[PDB]
């Protein structure tokens, strides 16, 4: 009894994750959540049973390695190399190809994509020999959480390629009924929620369309409902989530799923993010508290 969890998170992540309910509920289960001062060497604090973190930069990486060398039995959530795979959008999706699950009901994968590094490479673009076709979507290569990294481009024809801002991933746009399925994972716990997405390109006035996250009224529109969109099968979502947990080596992540409406039963993972916002997930205090108990009780048992 009485495990300690040191946490190193940005101030806005502390405000949303470290709530009173979470602190107090973990404390009665015996989990002591302790704030890491990142302005002081990690190795000079604690020691902690577990280090939970979401910090950028090589020096934090240096400090984790330093810390884990002196306390090789402390659990690190999560491994910095595992987190780091999610920072380049090519390497981000590589784990999907390693997930092996029995599910002949439906297939899964990632959309076709190619990388455009600079201006010269835009000029050399040939979608055809890559098996790409227009409707493509250009995504910044680096997923660093900056505003820039979310600024995206829909390209409808040859012109509009001129609006690419490399380094970019060039990815086929998949008609998916205008709804993403965001799957949240905490260890073996799996929750899914629908969210609005881009409309289908009905195979207009522009050869490109930039869009982001912030993408008023007075212009008439009826907001489409997502009720009638079918969820992917529950068994498939949770088996893929737990396969991904095992391949990425990440305990806390979400991934975005779209259904490829061209086929019926093909699902594509288009995004995987480390340690997303959990504070409005129902019951998140008990789910996160039980997760810490489970992983600390597993690790303490070894
Ligand atoms: N291959 C694709 N086909 C169709 N829509 C896509 C595709 N990739 C991304 N999108 C749309 O763009 C949005 C952002 O893409 P995503 O890869 O999730 O970026 P971010 O990391 O900024 O969330 C998605 O929520 C989805 O609506
Ligand atoms: Mg400090
Ligand atoms: Mg996303
Ligand atoms: Mg993302």
UniProtKB/TrEMBL annotation:
ATP binds at residues 89, 139, 171-182, 197. 1D-myo-inositol 1,3,4-trisphosphate binds at residues 13, 54, 150, 182, 273, 277. Mg(2+) 3 binds at residues 271, 273. Residues 5-83 form the Inositol-tetrakisphosphate 1-kinase N-terminal domain. Mg(2+) 1 binds at residues 37, 39, 256, 271. Its EC number is 2.7.1.134. Its cofactor is Mg(2+). Monomer. Belongs to the ITPK1 family. ADP binds at residues 89, 139, 150, 172, 174, 197. It is an enzyme of class 2 (transferase). Binds 2 magnesium ions per subunit. It catalyses: 1D-myo-inositol 3,4,5,6-tetrakisphosphate + ATP = 1D-myo-inositol 1,3,4,5,6-pentakisphosphate + ADP + H(+). Keywords: ATP-binding, Kinase, Magnesium, Metal-binding, Nucleotide-binding, Transferase. Mg(2+) 2 binds at residues 256, 271, 273. Residues 104-294 form the Inositol 1,3,4-trisphosphate 5/6-kinase ATP-grasp domain. GO terms for molecular function: ATP binding; inositol-1,3,4-trisphosphate 5-kinase activity; inositol-1,3,4-trisphosphate 6-kinase activity; inositol-3,4,5,6-tetrakisphosphate 1-kinase activity; magnesium ion binding. This is Inositol-tetrakisphosphate 1-kinase. The gene is ipka.
